[PDB]
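Ticket #4471: complex job returned nothing on first submit. Input attached below:
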Amino acid sequence: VFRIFKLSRHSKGLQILGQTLKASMRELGLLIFFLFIGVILFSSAVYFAEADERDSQFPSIPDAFWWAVVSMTTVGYGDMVPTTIGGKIVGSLCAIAGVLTIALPVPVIVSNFNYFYHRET
Amino acid sequence: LLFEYPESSGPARIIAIVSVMVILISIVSFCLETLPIFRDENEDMHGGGVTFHTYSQSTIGYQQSTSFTDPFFIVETLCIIWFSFEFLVRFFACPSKAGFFTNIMNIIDIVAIIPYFITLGTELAEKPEDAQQGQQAMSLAILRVIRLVRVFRIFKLSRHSKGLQILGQTLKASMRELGLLIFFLFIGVILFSSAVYFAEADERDSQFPSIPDAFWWAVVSMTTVGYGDMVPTTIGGKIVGSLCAIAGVLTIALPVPVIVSNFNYFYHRET
Ligand SMILES: [K+]
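Support reply: We reran it on our side without changes. The output follows.
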């Protein structure tokens, strides 16, 4: 899987992508950290709010965690979906929270990348 | 006490890494325990079936498998107590009564324990006449609080989590911007649901009309989640899909730059 990477000596963009990430870690570390908190929270409510009526998105937390991550990144594979009413708000508040939190660490990483790409060029 | 606060809030030492670890290990624990309420029970099975002499004594099993939560109750019992010991020490600080300035960290702290502690008394939530009249089968108080409360536990992290302090300050001081987003989204959602309603149900079986169901679709389609649970086989919603999805991204993108900016000044700051 790792083989691809080597390319970066004949790939300037990768040198640029690297320098950003290696020097942009705290910003990236926050994103995933925030996402973690979000994911956990938004999973535990749907749990408390769905399983009463039968067959909906399998409760057990590490399965509702799949849904939460997905719904936010706004991927929504549709593998997890609730026929119920309680998760209706969650869908709303979660999806909203995703875009908010996801958009947060973007401008910084992007900015770093802009100075770095503009540079070796 | 000027030497216990060294052990308490302020300095960076062993006790801070342990508390965050209790939180994390604790969260992981409750998580896994809540999954299979019944341990190692789904597999080879049987029941009350008349086929032959077999259904008679049905193999319910008389010594099957141990059922236990003591050690995890230990996770909860021991955490709440350190919470209270410390929080109780945190009183050897400075006190008052309010609901605004004081300390949201202390409110959040108390909010995780007081529920589990409370839940242990069989009941004491005599709430409403019509409800209490017959608490009958109702674990309603337990239904409401027990899960909201434990959901809340994660938050505490924010004293050892700067990003959360930053996320907070933004939101608390960025409310009007956030309030507009949801308000705009509301207007959008409602509107975009009522047209599809007028435009879909003529031919049969499409996305269940009734407005609070088309509202699910509208919110989803915009946030651009599109679970595919609601989709129309029809032609009228075709434009709506277009105009709605377009409107979503437009409206959603609007309150982003402000909240982000606030966050940038706040994150850049404590740093
Ligand atoms: K986007």
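Chain B has two domains: 1-160, 161-271. Closing as resolved unless it happens again.
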